Amino acid sequence: SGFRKMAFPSGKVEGCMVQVTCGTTTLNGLWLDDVVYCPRHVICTSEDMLNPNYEDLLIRKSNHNFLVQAGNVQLRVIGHSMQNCVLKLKVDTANPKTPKYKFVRIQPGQTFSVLACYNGSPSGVYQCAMRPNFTIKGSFLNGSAGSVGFNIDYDCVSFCYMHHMELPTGVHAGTDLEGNFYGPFVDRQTAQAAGTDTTITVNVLAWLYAAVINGDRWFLNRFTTTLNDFNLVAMKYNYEPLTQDHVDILGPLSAQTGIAVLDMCASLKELLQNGMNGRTILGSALLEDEFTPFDVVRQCSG
């Protein structure tokens, strides 16, 4: 029992992290087979950060302008290209520790583990959710760009995030591994702001189920609700509409606990309209929405 923000073991990803330096600016790269993936703003100087034309900046670069360091070994760059907002640096040695992997673009509401890195070396790991407004609430300092987010299934690492930047409100933004940003953001320091955010309803419900599996039940009630009645309350509190696909995904947790999804919705309704009265659920005084149904099943008993 117990329920914690649990990240995947980071070893397989640690073995792929390298440092990339172009001039005076340094960040992290991900070294898989004979390709190093990194954010394209590594080619910028501190002055090229406001409104860079990356095509111009890149055409002015050669292979030898890119220094790649894997531990204390220098990798020779033998080719480069730009795919959206990432660079693909082809090097002369394939990473011998490359794990089985895949590149995936995740959906708002999904989670992943971040290995925060500086100068090609790891600092720590933590869990993040992709918010409905395409930001993540991370812990990233200058130099952290190129750190990646991932999920591990069996021993196949599914990479889904590469870090690029910090927005003014202190939330974080990046791309998939093909260089397409999550959200309407661009890798420049022109004025930008994250849109309004919402709470991930299906995740709050999964988290309530986790609490029940771990013996917390004070929030349960005898009431039920329809999906449409619930969504009218949901919208009133900045919650994502619950869909039938969300009901279906909560099936296993519903079956395991014997609480109908719409009965748990009635529970959540009462929590939203009345608060928690200074009590807590799984050690939290806020309704947590950064655990997926899959995260609950992975951690909890059966």
């Binding site: 760009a145 870090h163 420049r188």
Partner: peptide, 6 residues
């Protein structure tokens, strides 16, 4: 503030 490329 401005966005910050990290």
């Amino acid at each position: 503030r401005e966005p910050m490329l990290q």
